[PDB]
């Protein structure tokens, strides 16, 4: 009842209202589910559960996990569930899949995330519209980017963490520009060629966001969330809104043995942490401290880190708190350069981690989410 | 790592655009979470996870499970997730909570469901509106009541099951009227007084739907889903749209022992089944066959049954397939009379089952969902 | 080329979202056009032009005057135009009809107004909706009740006139309550029985608004437009939003002679005035001063007055400025009690004036409109 | 009480959602009103009335004629009215201005039309949205381009006229391509330089639509309105939707004499006709027959014609019915090439006619409108 990763794939990540606009989160979920099954070397008939992270579910139909599963030729007998833990959604999906295996209920599952922020709608409230009209509510704002407890944007919340660490505009901007550099370098060298599956639309084969940097504009931008003169977070050093999906097939040790399989990684452990909503940016290091403690490891044991870059400060805070070598963190770039399709990013950083690790190396992927939580997973590359 | 139910409570179920309109799914979720914690006799500080079923999540904010948890004074360190398995959502929530305990990850969790169908919005699509305009999409239809694979209403799908069993309008209507009779009788005798928690708005203390039956109108209604002359399902013998919530606190055997607690029930087993989307109505008996097989039980072992009444045919098919005594099924009425707040109904039928069972009796609660799946749980009353 | 009124009829005036909701402005316009033609004793084939006042034209189709004309069996060869002078619209319609006759172009026309404020829609702007959404604009506000030059409600503007005359809450409220008294008395005594035509929907036969007064509530209301403590205008002493229509058939002296007709009144003269938008409330007395001057008359020559009661202050200011006997003004009540369907009110007060006048008496009807204008007409009852 | 044209100006006509999108119909109306006043050589204080044609008035505020008048520094005492006769609206405006002068009521008026089809909104109906949602109605369709009596597009109606004259796709397309040729030639030679006033936005100085012809695509297009195989009208041989405005200052003979003015043209006569809505395309020749009859003229008396090109068939039918020399008709191109801002086109073709005529020449401008009417005016160039 050990947990192995058989496959780990992702779409390229597209910009908002760009190349993937005509494809739904269901469509993208089918792309990565089908390809993850193909690369797992198991038939779709062997997949027992489909677990899908998705945040902006409005307008997509009943339980998109079931739509994806059926369209991916997974048996009607297999169980399908869609889950929402904001940015952590598809990391939670992977953790749920691991748990199902750990407890002996399942042998083989597919865990993924998919998000089409391009197709998030606007809301008209139920019940008659009063004299004077009403605001059309943006799903992206209300259900995606605004903290619902503090009733302010996650980027305004993150400014608190900026101040708490005495970070500067200069550091946030340098971090962002370096995320773009690493992403550009990775694409130039073909470093994403093991993990990216092309999406027919005529075909998207490369991430879009990293090409959009206008360097000379970065110091000219005005703070986007805090405008009292002390602001630091801008459109350039915050992640963007994006479309994409990512998937892993998980299988038990028994399946691996019986099938003579060659899994690509092993899930060793996971941890979850929670803090005040406003402080969500520092939850990942808390989850990692728990992860390493329970695993009898320390930071130096870990070859590579993925910390999802909700904002540049997310990366900086993580690196500073855990006293990491920055050169071992997000080595192929992170979401500030690659984009952040909310429901997909949890699985997306696990996919990137798996394929950056060399054999026998340990990696940690960690992600925060609006509301004050974070999830982390420890993996060993085989 | 046995799984006990410490508490099981629900709101009254309100009609569409009625007494609970001013309360959100978050508000209702807080009501039942707070009261479930109170009746568990554990402090809110002991709750380790909050797992919430919800289908129509549009406009409600980030991850309503986290909103509910925080507003219920559960620690910021506790983990919160919202899940969508259409009508099965909060049965899945309970199963997830049981699994977390089974695997030794958690000791104490709260599992619930909440749905405010009154506040489900309409959708305007992203991107510019073409010449000629566009349809405003109803969340209730698109994300709640329409099967997304067959692209037709669940009630049209259920007509297939009607034909497959050779059920008649006469049987469907008699079943419906009897669900209302049992609900009315239960409320007259106070049978829901252990489980219902009143909701301040001036206060809702009783289910609303069961009072709305107009008997003489039932045979006069025209089929609502199939109009070719062979239709049988009507507004009266189908469940309605509704607002409500239901919650259980679950705890491990270790917690019970250490705390000298008196749990009210034990979760013995669960099962999940899946079939073709159009055949969703017959999935519950399939789940129960699995449940009983793996538990070494047969149908006669079971004192009481709850089968969620998506439609009258749901109950009839279940009873016929499993050859049950109808007098042991939904003894206090079912959703055709009580209402069907989608995300809440899974937990709601577990709550009703728990409090109808007498000590040492075994009960089964089963629920189907759009897309072709069903979930079932076996419980022992203590 | 003298101008005679052959007929003058109106619908009852219905409250907002009340009995006439299912009828469009076109439907109501057809009712009064058909009945005005009937009572003119001329065939519909003789009507040469149809001139219709209407303010909230959104969603009603092309040129509602043509829709009304065709559906009223007026020849396809007859000319149809819809005009907007806000509250003055159908007084302008009558003036246009008189001018067409005066200049010898036409012999016979129908001039009317129709407004269904119940069916005024909300607006979604053209072009893609930005991040964060957009306000749904209320047609009633934007195109009806807000002054577009001052960008504030007409009721806020009218507070300036209140201050300029040193009027008091006490006077405004007493005026309002008296408008209701006169309307109630008129309906009790059958005084509207010559002019009102019933509207089949099962039938509306009486004005609705005047029955809605709650006397004891009037001094308890808070100012609706000005909230700095100096406000005086409230929901009770302002006119309401309403549905209704009114129509007159006009004919030349030549037609009357050739047809041996018995016209009910003669149009002697008209005048139009304009002032600053904020001062629109005092434009009617300015128009009347011009009207009387050019006609060689003085105020004492005039038996009865109709001053459209946009607000109670409209009536008070008019009476004070012209030094009128209040008992000769709006003797059957005015729009504060009867309602104010914007596009219809100009013709509606001419209809009420015509039928309150006794033979050989002179009457003046005057009406202000948002933007700072007013229209007045002098008539002689035959 | 003769009627003279002192000035006649227009904006360039912009394409839908193009260069003038940021300008409202009020903004464009102010541009042409101010410039018409400037070129009339009278001060704005002398303008006694402002009469404005406009069809799609939704969202624009109260009585746009008053907004335009005030913003153009015309006295608050001057009278302002907005009128809707669909495509004929601003020809009707000019006729109303002429009548006001003819009857001796006014000496000096400005008559214009303005339309911003780019800013026509969508409509949400009043009252609560039913289960299943509702269609968002396009103002352009419902209030502009659909005949409201036949409940079909004006282009489908026009196919009847195509059949009645045995016109062919080949003739309609050749006519369209020639309208574009004449427009292109006119702009190349500077023929619109007397009438066009540039619009600051950085500035629009030339009509946009005529540049958009793709010749080789014209025979490839499918009929847009009638798809049973007998259709002939396409996007290329129908007019387009557009933004623009046009204005004339009119003055009496007395004003001209007293002011020592040099008017540019004289309005000799006007006529109006009406037919069945479906037959609206043949109303213009009917109006012209009346115009010429009452004026003691015949077709050969007329140097130049403007027939508004709602469709290519509009021009062809007019030319055929009146047996005109095509080389004297729309000599600088017509609306199929220049665009058709509905409320503006009536005045726009009068402006183009005035400035194409040489001194002492007679011209006729004629325009049809949805609903079955047409207006025509006879002018003499001075
Ligand atoms: C509304 C939203 C779409 C921003 O609106 P937008 O118009 O797309 O913002 P832009 O990308 O155009 O950026 C604003 C300006 O910054 C500039 N800019 C943005 N990214 C840049 C980069 N990487 N380099 C240089 N300049 C950049 C743009 O050129 C733009 O133009 P301007 O400076 O001339 O005004 C916003 O939702 C978003 O993209 N991100 C929100 C941040 C966030 O919370 N993300 C979620 C992670 S949890
Ligand atoms: C749209 C929706 C709200 C139905 O619209 P509705 O207007 O509320 O339908 P009504 O409740 O008014 O019922 C229609 C008619 O049946 C009658 N009716 C409904 N329930 C009745 C009952 N229990 N007894 C007698 N008559 C009943 C009503 O009087 C109504 O009036 P009418 O016969 O004079 O026309 C629909 O979404 C719904 O309620 N249920 C859908 C069924 C479904 O799939 N439910 C989800 C379970 S998965
Ligand atoms: C938005 C609009 C509909 C007002 O909203 P509304 O909800 O209908 O306002 P109401 O009629 O309910 O009045 C508000 C309160 O005053 C009271 N009220 C209104 N008219 C009253 C009367 N004649 N006597 C006693 N009380 C009255 C109501 O009871 C109401 O209840 P509350 O005091 O318990 O709060 C507004 O557009 C309107 O009706 N008139 C605007 C005034 C105006 O400019 N009219 C146009 C003329 S140019
Ligand atoms: C909805 C509306 C905007 C048409 O939609 P649209 O997308 O703008 O239509 P288009 O201009 O793109 O034309 C459709 C196609 O014809 C082609 N086309 C249009 N005008 C053309 C021209 N002058 N030459 C060659 N091709 C042309 C376009 O290239 C387009 O592309 P496609 O052939 O590759 O599909 C419509 O309202 C309209 O423009 N006119 C309606 C006609 C009408 O009644 N006008 C009112 C006068 S009363």
From TrEMBL, chains A, B, C, D:
Residues 3-252 form the Thiolase N-terminal domain. It comes from the Eukaryota. GO terms for biological process: fatty acid beta-oxidation. Keywords: Acyltransferase, Transferase. Residues 261-381 form the Thiolase C-terminal domain. CoA binds at residues 180, 214, 217, 239. PROSITE patterns: THIOLASE_1, THIOLASE_2, THIOLASE_3. Coiled coil: none annotated. SUPFAM superfamilies: Thiolase-like. Pathway: Lipid metabolism. The keyword Transferase applies. The active site is at residues 87, 340, 368. Pfam families: Thiolase_C, Thiolase_N. The keyword Cytoplasm does not apply. The modification Cysteine sulfenic acid (-SOH) is found at residue 87. One of its GO terms (molecular function) is acetyl-CoA C-acetyltransferase activity. GO terms for cellular component: mitochondrion. Belongs to the thiolase-like superfamily. Thiolase family. PANTHER family: ACETYL-COA C-ACETYLTRANSFERASE, ACETYL-COA C-ACYLTRANSFERASE. This is Acetyl-CoA acetyltransferase A. It comes from Ascaris suum (Pig roundworm). The lineage of its organism: Eukaryota, Metazoa, Ecdysozoa, Nematoda, Chromadorea.
